[PDB]
Design an enzyme around this catalytic site. Structure first.
Site, PDB file in Angstrom:
ATOM      1  N   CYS A   1       1.526  -1.144  -0.131  1.00  0.00           N
ATOM      2  CA  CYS A   1      -0.298   0.029   0.168  1.00  0.00           C
ATOM      3  C   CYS A   1       0.909   1.243   0.008  1.00  0.00           C
ATOM      4  O   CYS A   1       1.015   1.898  -0.924  1.00  0.00           O
ATOM      5  CB  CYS A   1      -0.986   0.159   1.443  1.00  0.00           C
ATOM      6  SG  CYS A   1      -1.837   0.940   1.011  1.00  0.00           S
TER       7      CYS A   1
ATOM      8  N   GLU B   1      -4.692  -3.638  -4.802  1.00  0.00           N
ATOM      9  CA  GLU B   1      -4.382  -2.231  -5.152  1.00  0.00           C
ATOM     10  C   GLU B   1      -4.927  -2.162  -6.395  1.00  0.00           C
ATOM     11  O   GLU B   1      -5.729  -1.082  -6.648  1.00  0.00           O
ATOM     12  CB  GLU B   1      -3.027  -1.945  -4.856  1.00  0.00           C
ATOM     13  CG  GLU B   1      -2.338  -1.039  -3.328  1.00  0.00           C
ATOM     14  CD  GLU B   1      -3.041   0.018  -2.857  1.00  0.00           C
ATOM     15  OE1 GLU B   1      -3.094   0.074  -3.361  1.00  0.00           O
ATOM     16  OE2 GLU B   1      -3.030  -0.547  -1.517  1.00  0.00           O
TER      17      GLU B   1
END
Lengths: 221, 216, 221, 216
Positions: free
Chosen positions: C139, C211
């Site tokens: 992330c 993601e």
């Protein structure tokens, strides 16, 4: 409210006899008067530093099991008061007893210390946020009534060494922390069954028993 | 050098020695222990075993390998389901209600809380290390009491000694030993020290359990 | 060091193709140029607020599974940057898009959001601190290389609206956070077996896949 | 009023309807599904079941009552140990190595991750609610496919339909239903809504699983 049973008051009443024993314990009475042998207090604050490290982990379980940003934030703030607080009561006595960072790193928790912190963690992990809220409450609440009691001996607050400790755990800010924990438990348990309440009482009493044994082992240093 | 299982064994032998020579334990081996103290022990150990089974369920969740998942799952079943405690539930007159109403002692709760907390904070290694003392120490206790003699022939205490020194019980302990050894062949010096610390902490709790049982 | 395999570099290389797809995704390219439809960005920052709430819980697992005060402190600090940070990138766009507190409270996470945060949590809980360190890394790291890439279009940083976002995720302070996470993973894995490394790689790749799907669902708003 | 189990059922019936009429699922019921897609499904479902068993182990750790601990423990054993997947492992030619090397798809990992995470963040109520959709939906799917006809008589697909509509499988689902109902009779309105949210999230994942299986 207020013809309805408050679970925090129910837990309080069941823990009174135990917290009374904590108040009149030689270690705690030693703080109140000012007579507690200084190396016994040193042993305690080392053990309590170790204890607080594990205590923070229970609050972290609070962050994970809270489903409400506000209460996550509140648990996160409690962790910070333990880890990132150079104004905390512990970091005051660390420099006053000139305790080295290496000594802290090398110190071992006693069984009584390990047992208590394991119990809060395990009950937190087996339960929900109610159990975490109940598991951390004895510690702050008993320290508050202990300090409020010691807050009149007199000369207890004015003591050049032990004054800081009694003032710290009786301050408006520490009161606000205990009040938050009490309010949280009350708001989480509005719909709890009789069996759930008994489970939380059992946790609260058990941690109270551990507190008494913690003072004991600090005195038996 | 030395297997890590043997390394932990070596560091706890002294505590296990104190366990073997404890009044409660020698009480079993020479039939002197009062029935009322053993009754109290049996209720506590039952409560103990319920929490101990949970550490094994924790092994199921943390095992990342189907074979050991299955081994942990079977260990839960073995703990729960012709059990030693049942025999003594029947032999003494302990009711289902008496078991449900019973409270674990502080010493009991501390021990199981400790195994749970270390299992949850760590990995499959830590759960394997946390449950090992319990089984292994009972094995060596029972092997020791076996040669007293007339320990095995005792009308009341024989069954307990027979059960914990049996081929099937030794195999369970051997599984736990071999699992720990095979989970740790890549562990650093610091990891081994952590596991040792767990193993001796639990051995201390075992001693305190026997002690608690003798106080009743 | 440095003839020895670095596990962070190994994870990085295995995630490159995916992070490249994130860089050239219409949503992210929209931020870089300044063309991304403003209500699509609004949808994203609501979803990301929800996402960050669950992300904080994974860092809380870090506090519980860390056995070292310093790393507990570091995890605790990361939680604070999410919960107690009015200077954070999110609270900037919340007031810029005049998003109400009630709208935040009423918002539902999408499946793609839930799936990702569940995965990090579950792997954290099934593993040790290594798995938590590996689960949170994609992330921050991907956001860093995304922002460093977008940091030259040009006019991307000078954009009156989207400039703040690119500057925020490319700042020296955010770099220091990613570096901490990378260093932590490297220091925890010095003795890891080949099989353990493959497990961590799998986590890192999976979160990278999430993601990409997160940007997708933010665009498909 | 209405049991909470029925309340969750009512709110998911629409999604289960979409599951029943899915090409993969109707493919089983009328023998049109290609063997290669079912093979892929079986490998995935195997991987799925390994993670699903862990949610049940989580039930063992969180159950504070010996009876439900035991029920969760037995559910782990039932999941692991004359299983439907084994039959199809043998019938198709899936090797032990092929299973060990297999990777779960994103849709697979998301679903099991979700059940685990909700179980861990909550209490025994949330674990009971998280595992229910899986069993219950298979029951209703299999009951629906049963009356096509010649669905049950099909040389390849019959076994699958027979297994998930059997007396023993229905009893497992009924246990899960009754457990949830008995764990929730004191739950607030907000708690019930949370449980509903879990139950429909998992139903959505079920739909995505069948979909994923059909894409192969």
């Amino acid at each position: 409210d207020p013809f309805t049973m408050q679970v925090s008051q129910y837990l309080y009443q069941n823990a009174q006899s135990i917290w009374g024993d904590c108040i009149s314990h030689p270690f705690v009475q030693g703080i109140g008067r000012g007579t507690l042998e200084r190396d016994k207090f040193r042993f305690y604050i080392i053990q309590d530093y170790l204890y607080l490290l594990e205590y923070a982990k229970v609050f972290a379980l609070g962050v994970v099991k809270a489903c409400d940003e506000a209460v996550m934030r509140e648990f996160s703030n409690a962790i910070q008061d333990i880890l990132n607080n150079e104004m905390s009561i512990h970091n005051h006595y660390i420099r006053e007893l000139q305790i080295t960072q290496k000594e802290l790193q090398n110190a071992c928790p006693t069984l009584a210390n390990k047992s208590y912190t394991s119990y809060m963690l395990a009950e937190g992990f087996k339960g929900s946020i109610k159990e975490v809220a109940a598991a951390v409450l004895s510690c702050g609440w008993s320290y508050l009534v202990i300090a409020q009691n010691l807050s009149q001996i007199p000369n207890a607050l004015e003591h050049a060494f032990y004054g800081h400790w009694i003032k710290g755990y009786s301050s408006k800010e520490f009161q606000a922390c205990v009040n938050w924990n009490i309010n949280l438990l009350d708001s989480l348990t509005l719909a709890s069954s009789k069996q759930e309440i008994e489970k939380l009482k059992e946790i609260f009493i058990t941690t109270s028993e551990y507190e008494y044994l913690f003072w004991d082992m600090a005195y038996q240093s």
